[PDB]
Paper text:
The malaria merozoite protein [name] ([name]) is critical for RBC invasion and is one of the most promising blood-stage vaccine candidates. We determined the X-ray crystal structures of SBD1 and insertion fusion immunogens 2 and 3 to resolutions of 1.80 Å, 1.85 Å, and 2.10 Å, respectively.
Insertion fusion immunogens 2 and 3 were constructed by replacing several amino acids in the DIf loop of [name] with [name] and a flanking Gly/Ser linker. Immunogen 3 lacks only amino acids 265-KDESKRNS-272, retaining Cys263 and the disulfide bridge. The disordered DII loop was replaced with a Gly/Ser linker in both of these insertion fusion immunogens to prevent the potential displacement of the fused [name]. In contrast, insertion fusion immunogens 2 and 3 retained the [name] binding mode of the complex but displayed local distortions in loops near the vicinity of the insertion sites, resulting in Cα RMSDs of 0.381 over 232 C-alpha residues and 0.309 Å over 228 C-alpha residues, respectively. However, the IC50 values elicited by the insertion fusion immunogens 2 and 3 were 1.5-2-fold higher (i.e., less potent), and they were significantly different from that of the [name] DI-DII-[name] complex (P < 0.005). Similar to [name] alone, the insertion fusion immunogens 2 and 3 produced potent strain-specific responses but were ineffective in inducing a broad immune response, possibly due to the insertion of [name] in the DIf loop. This insertion results in a loss of strain-transcending functional activity, suggesting that either the local structural perturbations introduced by the insertion fusion disrupt strain-transcending epitopes or epitopes within the DIf loop contribute to protection breadth.
Residue numbers in the entry: 7 to 159, 177 to 209, 219 to 295, 300 to 349
């Protein structure tokens, strides 16, 4: 007897996303006998990036390679021959022009599939696929070489997402081609929604083709998450109030408290939702799936997955 069922489906994080948000390590994959953790969420995480502590290096900088003094880098794939990352949207469309399955794929899905094309060469039967970040401003897809997302002070490295030490990769696309790093690969960090990440989307290998329709992106203006009980949309019974100067800060707080696979698997369970009161500047965070919306002109409904700025009616 709930008329909101279909509308609210995209806010059922456990179902539509199915993995952690702050830290997504929801699946395991073997590469040459060794198990690794890797992101597996089905929805893009809008505005998510990685902040490297004691550094000005943007995390989309390619991972450091070589042995040079002051060697420094980020998380993205280093140069390869041919160059696989970063790749603009038009370069991806031209690169896959002979693959008729990539037609009509939107920017984010194409980027996730591009990142999933590289197989750690030591195991052709491996399901290991690297995650990616799409920059909607420059229209660039960055394949992440490091799948780890948090390290604030070996198996314990594997437990945070340390990927396989891989220098050569085989493409899943046919005809197969082997692509190796031009050099050998050799810090503490945390995920966050920083204002400088506003145009970024963090993408696991599992981002679904139809994310635009099933996943949350825009925050809901004049709306408040509730629970459907006996013909009425009741308030969430238990919330944690936090001060938030605007919607962005509230979305940032929801993201920090959201489902996390950091040491093991949340499967999407967590403080993933927030009702932001724009009059009292309060962020009301909760960990129960909402099943209806309340009409309240002072509220904006947000989720950890949602873009931290964009709103809709």
């Amino acid at each position: 007897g709930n008329p909101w069922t279909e509308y609210m489906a995209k806010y059922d994080i456990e179902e539509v996303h199915g993995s952690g948000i702050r830290v997504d390590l929801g699946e395991d994959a073997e590469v040459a006998g060794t198990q690794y953790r890797l992101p597996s969420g089905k929805c893009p995480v809008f505005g998510k990036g990685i902040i490297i502590e004691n550094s000005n290096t943007a995390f989309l900088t390619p991972v450091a390679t070589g042995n040079q003094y002051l060697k420094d880098g980020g998380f993205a794939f280093p140069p390869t021959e041919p160059l696989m990352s970063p790749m603009t949207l038009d370069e991806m469309r031209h690169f896959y022009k002979d693959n008729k399955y990539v037609k009509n794929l939107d920017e984010l899905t194409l980027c996730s599939r591009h990142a999933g094309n590289m197989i750690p060469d030591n195991d052709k039967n491996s399901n290991y696929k690297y995650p990616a970040v799409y920059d909607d401003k420059d229209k660039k897809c960055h394949i992440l070489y490091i799948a780890a997302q948090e390290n604030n002070g070996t198996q314990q490295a594997k437990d945070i997402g340390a990927g396989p030490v891989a220098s050569c990769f085989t493409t899943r696309m046919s005809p197969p081609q082997q692509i190796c790093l031009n050099s050998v690969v050799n810090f503490c960090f945390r995920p966050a929604k920083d204002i400088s990440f506003q145009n970024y989307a963090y993408l696991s290998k599992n981002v679904v083709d139809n994310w635009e329709k099933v996943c949350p992106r825009k925050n809901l203006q004049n709306a408040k998450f509730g629970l459907w009980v006996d013909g009425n949309c009741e308030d969430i019974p238990h919330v944690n109030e936090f001060p938030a100067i605007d919607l962005f800060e509230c979305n940032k707080l929801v993201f920090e408290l959201s489902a996390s696979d950091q040491p093991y698997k949340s499967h999407g369970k967590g403080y993933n939702w927030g009702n932001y009161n724009t009059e009292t500047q309060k962020c009301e965070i909760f960990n129960v799936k909402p099943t209806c919306l309340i009409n309240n002109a002072a509220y904006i409904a947000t989720t950890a997955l949602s873009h931290p700025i964009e709103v809709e009616g």
